[PDB]
Structures are given as structure tokens and as C-alpha cells.
Amino acid sequence: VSEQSLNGRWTLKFFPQPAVPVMTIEGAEAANGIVVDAVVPGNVEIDMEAAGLVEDPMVGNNIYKLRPYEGYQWYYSRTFAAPVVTEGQRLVLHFGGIDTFAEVYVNGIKVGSADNMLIEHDYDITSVVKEGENRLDVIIRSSVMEAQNHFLGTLSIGNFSNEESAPVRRAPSTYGWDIMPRLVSAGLWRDVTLRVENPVTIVDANWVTLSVNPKAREASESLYLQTRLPFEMHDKVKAVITISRDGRQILRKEALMRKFANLFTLNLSGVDAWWPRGYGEPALYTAEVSLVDVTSGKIYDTKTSKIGFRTVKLELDEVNLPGQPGQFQFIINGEPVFAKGTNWVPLDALHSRDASHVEEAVQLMVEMNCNIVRCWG
Amino acid sequence: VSEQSLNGRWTLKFFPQPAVPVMTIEGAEAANGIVVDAVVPGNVEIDMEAAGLVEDPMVGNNIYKLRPYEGYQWYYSRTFAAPVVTEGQRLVLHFGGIDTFAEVYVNGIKVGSADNMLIEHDYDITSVVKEGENRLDVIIRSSVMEAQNHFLGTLSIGNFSNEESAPVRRAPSTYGWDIMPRLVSAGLWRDVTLRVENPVTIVDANWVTLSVNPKAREASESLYLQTRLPFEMHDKVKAVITISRDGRQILRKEALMRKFANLFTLNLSGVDAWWPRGYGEPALYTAEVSLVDVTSGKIYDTKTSKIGFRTVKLELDEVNLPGQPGQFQFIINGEPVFAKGTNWVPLDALHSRDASHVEEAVQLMVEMNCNIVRCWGGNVYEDTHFFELCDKYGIMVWQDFAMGCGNYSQRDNFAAALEKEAISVVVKLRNHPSLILWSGPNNDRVSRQVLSRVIYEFDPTRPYLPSSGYYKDPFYTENPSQFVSQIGYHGCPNRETLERMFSPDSVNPWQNGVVGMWNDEWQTKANRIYDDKFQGGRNDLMTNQVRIIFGEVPADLDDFIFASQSVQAEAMKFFVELWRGRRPYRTGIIWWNIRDGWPLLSDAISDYWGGKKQAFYYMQNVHHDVCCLINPAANGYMLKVDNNTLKDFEGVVEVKDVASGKQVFKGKFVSKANQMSEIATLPMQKGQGMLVISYRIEGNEYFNHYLYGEPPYKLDQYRKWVKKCGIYE
Description:
This is part of a larger assembly, with two copies of chain A.
Chain A: E1 2-5, E2 8-16, H1 25-30, E3 34-40, H2 44-50, E4 72-81, E5 90-95, E6 98-99, E7 101-106, E8 109-115, E9 121-124, E10 133-140, H3 143-146, E11 187-188, E12 192-197, E13 201-213, E14 218-228, E15 237-245, E16 248-256, E17 261-269, E18 285-293, E19 299-307, E20 312-316, E21 328-332, E22 335-336, E23 341-344, H4 358-368, E24 372-375
Parallel strand pairs in A: 23-24
Antiparallel strand pairs in A: 1-12, 2-3, 2-4, 4-10, 5-9, 5-12, 6-11, 7-8, 7-10, 13-14, 14-17, 15-16, 15-18, 18-19, 20-21, 21-22
């Protein structure tokens, strides 16, 4: 129905982590720490430099001066107006990125516990949200100290990746590499939003290119659609599939929703294939699917994404060193492409600034004419 | 000690499921619904038709009128007197079948949560039962809505099995198939009882045939006995094993119970082996084990079951397509048996009526002389009595695990729910001699790990197989599989069935008299899972087959029924004769199918109401233990005789043309045991016609026929050939 954003100014209170880490709001407020203004999405080091508490780590040996903060806790807090929810609607609190181990409270009620900085986190706060001003509190603990909650196997010690990185789900380069500095950091480094979902909603729209014929401008595309559908809405809701490019509608298919999960296959004509750089055009088509009430015409949900009709196959060599690394070739749309490109390292040691560099960084590959890029583990 | 039954009249309250499903008694009573009388075991649709709330779903398009109830909840409730329990005794509440997701309360205390309609459910209500009147409440929620509690993998969407069937443990055919209608249903479809167990009780009595020597009438049988035994009862209780047959005691062994779990081996003499139909007698022996007090003589528990001394081995081919499907042969008691039988589909879309059809349905296989039956994975697991009849009548059982067409989840939740189901079904059925095989891209955790590990630990005696329009077309006649699952041919049911399941105006198939078009009712009885109005599809399989064999489609209804049934009769007979005549390479044939589970237009040879189609009688004559048949040859036809027994037979076979009466062949034959024998190469006949195969063995006249020539045939002429032949009617 809507997506209210919770980005902006938050309250950040940081303090050294005690022997028993702080998990509750009472302990976080009782702890003796410093309170400064914070920006979400952001990194805690950015908020402290804005407060004049840390020097610029990009200059000289200032990076080492952030060392004590690896054992600090970080208490994000803000208020928010609750969006309007009607009966059957669900209120979801969405985190694009929590770095890392945090307890999330809404109006003093714990709604989740995060432990992976690389994936999104969604919590159903429908039953805990209140009318009017609400409170949202996130209490992050030390990622480095979290490693001492595990016993490492022999093979996990002594590698180039830090031992602290082995038992936790974080970016290994944040602990230090030969190309990226050590800067564990913390904070809400991606968007925080409030989402309202109708009882009839799209759970997943999976687009799959079954086959492609670039010469005949044909393609067979599959849509694996999973939805949330109350049984009173079975046979009363229809799926509206729409393929278009540059405003011109290529296909509009309608089908009655009789199940919650369906597979739709579309045999398309006059459609171009997606090619990497040099081997043709990167033809993209707008693929939209909406759940519409058959009687009232109400649109309950709409999922839109730009897809490309393309097939990928990895032809492995069977003579010259069969099974050894590098003995393969990518087969795109049946053609053996020659890959030329770069390795993708972190865009910023403070990863909340990543999104601000993607445009410039991708444009480097466009000028370089890379047809491939490997996002480094 | 005792087993009090809780079957009978219950109170059923149904209501649409809210956004938050009802899980408690307070919410169930607070919900606004309808209360009617219910029968247990039963289906909720049966109770509502008894209340006059739903029309007969077996007639016309009434099946679609049950659609809203797939999103309903069902509140079973009844009172019961508590049986007398003494100290140490346990009171167990037994459910034979809960369909499906239900919360079970006894005196307002939740005693269990069910989530598998195919296995039993037992709850210890000893600490919650009260003296006097007790209350038992079962709150079932929507099975269809339960699917939306899961995220399906890519390979679970788009298969023939419904997406709603993928994440739940139910019979996949209940959501709709091409042979069974969509009817999710709900309720307590099997027995509900109260069981009292002594502190000394038998947990499991596993009977295993180690070896058998049919000639010397010897067998080595193992008893894996697990018991519940208080340590104060160790060395004070004895196990009394008893093997008997027809009242005569064969062996009585006694042993002091010094442990809770023991293995007993019995070397028996003067005991006959269990054989499938044709290969000998289905010899069954009553095997009883009792735990008796050494001093007081008190019998604490007794487990009795009829077992059969039999060994099963699956010899897999290693030359002709090694590893491909169908390249195997069953080795029963050391002998390579040739399997002939049918696929087992649901006995009823409302599965509480299954038990009422087992006797009649199994008797169809006995008349058909099937020595094997494959229980299809789209169906529920049949109860104990079905296997008892298969044990008694010598019909081997191929058991699929309840898995439908498509790939399933590879995660821990589905594996754990399936492991619990497989362990439960294996322990329950592993003692039946009729059961001979378990059956489940080569990286599927379900078939290559979960199910295989269960068989490895709980049934190491049976093989496990991870298997997940002219009838003379080379598509059929050039099948490379030694063990074939024949697809089956469509056949219009007997006229009486049409007038019973169709509206009077819809008995005739042609809508507005147009030959080529079916009305909306015949399209429904072609299994149209959802009421989407179209024309064509599966129903065209009927008229297409009649057109290939007889040229045109008869406008007259009775002319169409006989024609469509004759096509199915000749086609299915040809398949059985073609595989029996291609031994020893061909090792078995299982065809689709002997009986329908709903009044429908299907490829089965007998309908839900017992109407045997023309194909049933044709198949009967080519299912004999010793059958004289004719196969097509390179330059004519080959008269042959197939032996599915262990004994040799002599006889005389005569081959004659129907119309002309000219004797084509007559001579003596020697049918060597457990093999097919060529008798003579018959010269090719002119044009169309039909031959008569008359053979006598041991003073018994058996009959068969062969339709020669190429289609299309003249329906009136073919009817004249069958009439003059005097084999069928």
C-alpha cells in the first residue's frame, strides 16, 4: 500500500561494551555513554566525525585511532508515526542492513534479533505498533567480541581472513586485508522503512528465461509467482502480466488467481535478447505483474522489474586439464563469449557510502568496456 | 488391557477460517458457524450432505460447489467415559487419521498438534484425563491456507501436483489430478480409540524371514522384539512365541525377558513358503508373542499377526540399459517371477469410505489374477486390512511413498516431516509378506537420502527404488523397459454409470447433438480441476481412439459405449500379450488401472460403482497362469504360450478364423514352467478379421482371440466377430 521511510536523523548513544553485553533498553539507557546525532543510513564513525569526536581516518595513521571503538556498543533510537493499517493489513519494519548483532525493540517490545550484516531484515510489528508516536530502538553489540562465543576448528585459524571473521556473517575485508583497511565499524548502513502489505500481496515474482532465439526475435519466459491470498479471495483476484519496452506494450496476459502459487509461461515474438558488451545490445524489458480484484478493480499489489531474455551456460573443458580451475567458458545465448573485466572490491570501508559511489564506479567499467565483473567474496 | 472405541456420533461445527486461524476451544466456540451431527470415521462433506447442506458431489458439476469449504475450519467435539487405569498403566488416545492440521484438546488441555493426514497419531492423555465424563475436542484448520506458511522452491512450482500440495503432508491427488477430482476435504477419516497399556507392554514385534527352503519346507524366521519393561520386571517376565497355522501349533518357544529388546531366531521345519499368485500358495502362519509373568501367569501384552515365510530380491540389469528405469526383475524365494498387475489409485475421494471398498476392490484383482499391485504415490497409505487381503490372496504390493509429480523441498523442515512419516509407515507395514518394494536430478535429498536412510535402518529386507493413438504404434511396441508401467487406454463406462452420475439432459455426450463437442457435464467428469469453461483436451482422447480403430464416431450412445470400450479392451489386451510374449527380457507389466475412485470418465477398466468395462473381461483372459496368445511377427503371426507358474503343463491349442471357420492351426504344446514358449508361426491372413485361440489344459477349456488386419475396422463387423466367437458378450 505504501512505504514510509525511516531514514534521517536518529539518536546514537555509544559506550564500551561491559563484560555482559547490553541487550535491553533499560541497560542501554543506564549505561554511561556519549549521545550524538546520527544519520541513517550511515556508519557510526561518520556520525562521530560529524560530532568532532574522531579525526578523518582517510588521512595518515588516523585509521588506527578507531581501534577502541571495535569493542563499543551502539544504541540507535528514534520515534516514528505509525502508518495507517486496516484489518488484514500487515505492518513490516524493513532493514536493508544492520551491522551487525543487534536487538530491535518497537515500543519496548523486542521484535527481532539480527546477526547478519549482508542480508535484509524484516519484522512484523503489526501487533506491537501503537496509535500515534512510536519508539524504535536498536542495540548493537561488539562484532569482534561476538567471535569469542565460538570454538574455531583448526583450519579456521591462521588463514588470511581474520579469525574474528570466521564465526560471524560479515564482510571479511572489514577486519583487514591487503587491499582494504581494518574498519569493523557498525550501524544501520542501509535503508530503514515501514511497509504496509495488503492481505492479497505478492510474495515473490521469479522471472526465468527458458529459451531465446535472437535471430527470430523470440523468447520463452517463465514467471514463478508466489502470493499471499486469503481463501475468500481465491477465484476473485486476477494476475495482470505486462511486458513492455520504451513504453510500448509487448504483451498483456490476464489469469484468474485460483492458487497462491502459479507458473506462467509466455512465448514472445518481436523481442530482442540481452547481450553483454560487444556481443550485442543489453535489451531490457519492463516486466510487471499485479494482483487486481476482478469486481472492484482494486490493485492489491504490483511487482515491477526490468528483465532480460538471456540464457547462460558454463561449458567446462574435458581435455586440457579437466576439472582444474579456469577450464571453462561462458555460453551466453548459445554463443561462446570471451570475458574481459575487473574484480569488484568494497566501494568504501564505511559501506553506507557504497550507494553514493555505485554510479561513478560502474561508469568506470563502461568506459573500460568490461563485459564482466566478479564481485569479490 | 483394552481398546475402547471413540467412533460414532460427534458434534461438528464449521465456519470460514478467519485471517488468524482458530487454535483454541474458546475461539472455536466464539466463532460464528453451523453445528451439525457428524460420524467418525468420516469426511465433513458426508456429514453436511446428511444434514442437507451440500448436494451429491458425484453427480454433474456438483463437485465444484464444495469449493468454498476448502477455506473452512472444522471443530470436532464429543464426550467420553474414561477407561479404568491402574498405577503404571498408560492411557493413549489413538487417531488412525486426522485430515489434517488440527489441535487436539482433552478436558481443555492441548495434548497434541497434528500435521500429517497419512500416519497415525497417538497422545498420552493419562495425566489429563479425569474421572467420569471427559471432553475431547479437535480443531482443524484449512489445509489449503496452510500452504501459504512456506516459500516454495523454483522446482516446486508448475508441476502437475498442485503447489498447495508441495509443502504439506497430504495425499497429492486430493488437490486434483487427471484421474481423481479435486476434493481437499477434512475430518477424522479413520478410527479414534482409547488404549490402555500395562507397564509391561510390547513396543514392536518385527518379523523377518531370513531364509526359506520351499522344497525342504524349512524357513529361518527372526523376531525383533522391543518392549517396555520396568526393571523390577526384568527376569520376572517371559516371552511366549507361538507359530501356528489352521489351529495347529507349529512352534512354541519361551524365553526369559532379561532385556527390553531381544532378537529371536526360529529354525522351522514343515513350513510352507509364501508365494504370489500363480507361483504357488500364499501360505500364511499366525505369529503370536506374549509377555507373561513367570509367577502369576499374568499376560501383560500380546501381539498377533499373520506372517509369510518369503524372501524378496530385486535383480537389476547390468547389460541392457544398466541403471535405466524398468531394468530389473523381482526374485521371490530365489525364483524370477513375472509381475502382472494394476496400479492402485484412491478408493474414494472421501477417503473415510476407503475401508468400505477394500474388500470389493481387492476381489477385482483376485478375479483379474494380479500377482502384483503398485500403490500409487498420489494416494494415501492403505490401512492394515488392505495388506491383510494381499497377504491372504498372494498379491505382492509395490508401495510408493506419498510423493507426487514434481520436485520437493531440500531443507530440514520437509526432511524432518517426511522422515517422521516414513519411519511411521515402514514400522507399520514391514511385517506383511505381500509388501515387496518401497519406491520414492540424482541429488534429491528426499529420494536419495531421507527415504533411503529410513529403509536402511528400519527395513533392510526389502529393496528401495528412488523412482520419484494406435496401440500398435512403435511408441508402445518399441519400449525398451523390461518392467513397464503401461499408460492405459480411455474407455466410456457402462451406460448404467452414465445415467447415475450425469443429469438426465447430460447423459448424451454431444452438446446440441454436435458430434465432436462435449457438454459441460462430460467435461467435468473428465476431471476439470477448476471450473474453467473450455472445449477439448482429455475428452478428445476418447473419440480419437474410436476414430482410429473404427473410422467414425458413432452418434448412438450405446454404439459409442461399446466402441470406446472395445478400443480400450483390445488395446490393453494387446499390451499384456505383447509383454508376456517377449519374455524372458520383459520382467513385468503394471497397467493403469483396475478401478476408479470417483464416478468419472477415465482409462480404468472398472468404474467406482463396480461396473466392469469390456476391457476387464479381455484382460482377465490374458492374465491366466498359462495363456495361449498370438503376437505380430515379421512375416505373419507367432502363436505362443506363457507360463507364470513353477509347474510344467501340456495341452492342445486350436486357432481358427471367426467368419470363415477355417482352422489355421491345431497341435499339442508343452508349456515349460516360468517361461514363454513359441508354439508355431501362423501364416498371414487376408484382409481384416479375427482369430479364435481355443486351448485345453488338464480338462479345462480356456479361450482367447486375436484381431488381425489394419484399422479402421467396421464396428458392426467387429461386433459380429465378437458375437460369433462366443468368448465375450
